[PDB]
């Protein structure tokens, strides 16, 4: 089919090991979050659970195609075939993607080379609580993510205009807590491997 | 041989088949007929606001590419070929760590009718959210949802 030949042409000669613009400029990843539910806050283990739809948008010049079709609205099959950012959550004690019935991932490629990659995630993130004012205590629990291997010179993250979306906030599993609000931050963190762009969401 | 004809039929069916594209792409909307047989309604976890349910989850759909003509109208085939064809990416919106049973083999079945009608069943244990009113507890009653749909494909 037309889409079949388009996909074969795009994958022909493609090297998923190399990020786009390997020696030109950093790859810019626009990140977006939808929070289905912030699970219970486990004060014993200094952690809380959060379920999200996590979306990342970037540009790959190799995936440009010229056709009457303006977008290839694909499924999880080519996620392992194209280059994907190695985004990881820094403060996660335990995290897992969703695999029932199929891997909960979505891939869309536009004719100009824009790739949108979304996936469902459930993350247990550590939140160091200061319980001096317990039970009249308030906390600002973070959720930080960055690129594991690519420093700031290779990958840079940006928050979209609609960065973090929430649904029915007060219908979540926060039995002992009330959600007041959230905010978004970006920072550069120095490590032995290099300097990395860490993006944080505080609840 | 009796089985070589079916081997050739399967090879010709999968030859040139692209499982990255849904049936009827650019021609129509892929209609999936679904039914759920609950083999056991699992216990309700009040602490987790959650309940377990064991289901045979059946989905059926048309695929013109998989039409064939042969000695039998229906090919009851091994589930391993289901990975080699397009199947809907159904997921549970309110699910929480469901498990696809794989003892001894993957508990799935795939059947292809001569007219290209596919039937595809899975065995699952779904753990789903059930928000609760505990103000009338223990005189309380709930309506636990089970919501599912495609992840990648819009209406």
């Amino acid at each position, epitope marked *: 089919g037309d889409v079949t030949v388009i996909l074969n042409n795009l994958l022909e000669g493609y090297d998923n090991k190399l990020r786009p613009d390997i020696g030109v400029k950093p790859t810019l990843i626009h990140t977006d979050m939808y929070v289905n539910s912030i699970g219970p806050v486990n004060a014993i283990n200094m952690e809380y659970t959060i379920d999200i739809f996590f979306a990342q948008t970037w540009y790959d010049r190799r995936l440009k195609f010229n056709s009457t079709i303006k977008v290839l609205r694909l499924n999880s099959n080519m996620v392992g075939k194209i280059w994907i950012p190695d985004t990881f959550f820094r403060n996660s004690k335990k995290a897992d993607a969703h695999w029932i019935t199929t891997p909960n991932r979505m891939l869309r490629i536009w004719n100009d080379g824009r790739v949108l990659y979304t996936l469902r995630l459930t993350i247990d993130a550590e939140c160091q609580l200061q319980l001096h004012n317990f039970p009249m205590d308030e906390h600002s629990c973070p959720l930080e993510f960055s690129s594991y291997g690519y420093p700031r010179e290779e990958i840079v993250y940006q928050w979209k205009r609609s960065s973090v979306e929430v*649904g*029915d906030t007060r*219908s979540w599993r926060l039995y002992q807590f009330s959600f007041v609000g959230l905010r978004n931050t970006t920072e550069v963190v120095k490590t032995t491997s290099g300097d990395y762009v860490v993006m944080s969401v505080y609840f | 041989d009796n089985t070589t004809v079916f081997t050739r039929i399967l090879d010709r069916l999968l030859d040139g088949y692209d499982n990255r594209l849904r049936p009827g792409l650019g021609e129509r909307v892929t209609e999936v007929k679904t039914d759920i047989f609950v083999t056991s309604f699992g216990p309700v976890s009040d602490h987790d606001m959650e309940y377990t349910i064991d289901v045979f989850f059946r989905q059926s759909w048309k695929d013109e590419r998989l039409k064939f003509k042969g000695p039998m109208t229906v090919l009851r085939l091994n589930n391993l070929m289901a990975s080699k064809i397009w199947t809907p990416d159904t997921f549970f919106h309110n699910g929480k760590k469901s498990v696809a049973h794989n003892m001894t083999m993957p508990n799935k079945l795939l059947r292809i009718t001569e007219d290209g009608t596919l039937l595809y069943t899975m065995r699952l244990t779904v753990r789903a959210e059930c928000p609760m*009113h505990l103000e009338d507890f223990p005189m309380d009653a*709930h309506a636990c949802p089970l919501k599912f749909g495609s992840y990648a494909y819009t209406r």
Partner: nanobody
Amino acid sequence: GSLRVSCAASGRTFTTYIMAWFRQAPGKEREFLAAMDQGRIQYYGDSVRGRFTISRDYAKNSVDLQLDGLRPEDTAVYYCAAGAGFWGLRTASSYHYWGQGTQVTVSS
């Protein structure tokens, strides 16, 4: 023409309710029109499918109904309901809260 009917609520820690709209034409019969879930899932009646669209502002604790393609047969009094859907989500008996109601009339 086009119209928008809003319905606001307050005075409860209770949230986990479907919020829905019902219609009374002259004749004393309740007709389900639309409903919206806590999962932002929208259910619509067959008669008014694709015409009326329901939405919910959860922070403001309100439900809005945008009405389009109105016709003379749509003249009626519209009621806003909120409640947990037990044995229901399409029957009026499952909603334990109702409003005053608002009239709408179409003149050709």
